[PDB]
Amino acid sequence: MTEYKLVVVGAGGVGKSALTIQLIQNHFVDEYDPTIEDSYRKQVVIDGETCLLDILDTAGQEEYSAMRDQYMRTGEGFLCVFAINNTKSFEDIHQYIEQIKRVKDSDDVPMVLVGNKCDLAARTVESRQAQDLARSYGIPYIETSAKTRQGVEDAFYTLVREIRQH
Numbered sequence: 001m002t003e004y005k006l007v008v009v010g011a012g013g014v015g016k017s018a019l020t021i022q023l024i025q026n027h028f029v030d031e032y033d034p035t036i037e038d039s040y041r042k043q044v045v046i047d048g049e050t051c052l053l054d055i056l057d058t059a060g061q062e063e064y065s066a067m068r069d070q071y072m073r074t075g076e077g078f079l080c081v082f083a084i085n086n087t088k089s090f091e092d093i094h095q096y097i098e099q100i101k102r103v104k105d106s107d108d109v110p111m112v113l114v115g116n117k118c119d120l121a122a123r124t125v126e127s128r129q130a131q132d133l134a135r136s137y138g139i140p141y142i143e144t145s146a147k148t149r150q151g152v153e154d155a156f157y158t159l160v161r162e163i164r165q166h
């Protein structure tokens, strides 16, 4: 079947694994469990087509930035996640996008900017500023909550569609 190599990237703690676990396993990891590198392969039906999601869940850890070039090379589409209650993760997310473009020698690589944790009250990143960043890059912006599942399928399936229409 058609396969989509998705990579989830972003600062530590933004909810990369929670987004993936919510998508693939229909539940929210309310727990501390840092990722090194994790891979999920789930066969889904998206707009009537059977396809294999091959999702690589990466580490936000401040080191491990050598293992990062290798999965950016192989990755087909990228979920670029920050948390709407963590301005630093937003500020850091431009650096991931830049590294994706450098490692893939392209600025037309399918990407979705994801503002996660949108259930929380103490938001520190306004949707308007996330909008501008996504617009400045030519990529959609989608807010998610891995806790309530809001926007989760939307974020991942839009990424698949960005790949399909690329």
Ligand SMILES: Nc1nc2c(ncn2[C@@H]2O[C@H](COP(=O)(O)OP(=O)(O)NP(=O)(O)O)[C@@H](O)[C@H]2O)c(=O)[nH]1
Residues within 6 Å of the ligand: 010, 011, 012, 013, 014, 015, 016, 017, 018, 019, 028, 029, 030, 031, 032, 033, 034, 035, 036, 058, 059, 060, 061, 116, 117, 118, 119, 120, 144, 145, 146, 147, 148
């Ligand atoms: N309220 C809320 N908490 C969330 C959400 N997503 C993740 N969290 C919480 O935030 C923490 C970090 O989640 P996690 O998915 O492990 O983040 P990560 O980006 O995968 N971390 P790492 O880079 O270390 O692998 C956990 O306590 C998790 O339950 C969300 O959508 N809403």
Ligand SMILES: [Ca+2]
Residues within 6 Å of the ligand: 102, 103, 104, 105
């Ligand atoms: Ca290069």
Ligand SMILES: [Ca+2]
Residues within 6 Å of the ligand: 107, 108
């Ligand atoms: Ca181009």
Ligand SMILES: [Mg+2]
Residues within 6 Å of the ligand: 016, 017, 018, 033, 034, 035, 057, 058
């Ligand atoms: Mg994780």
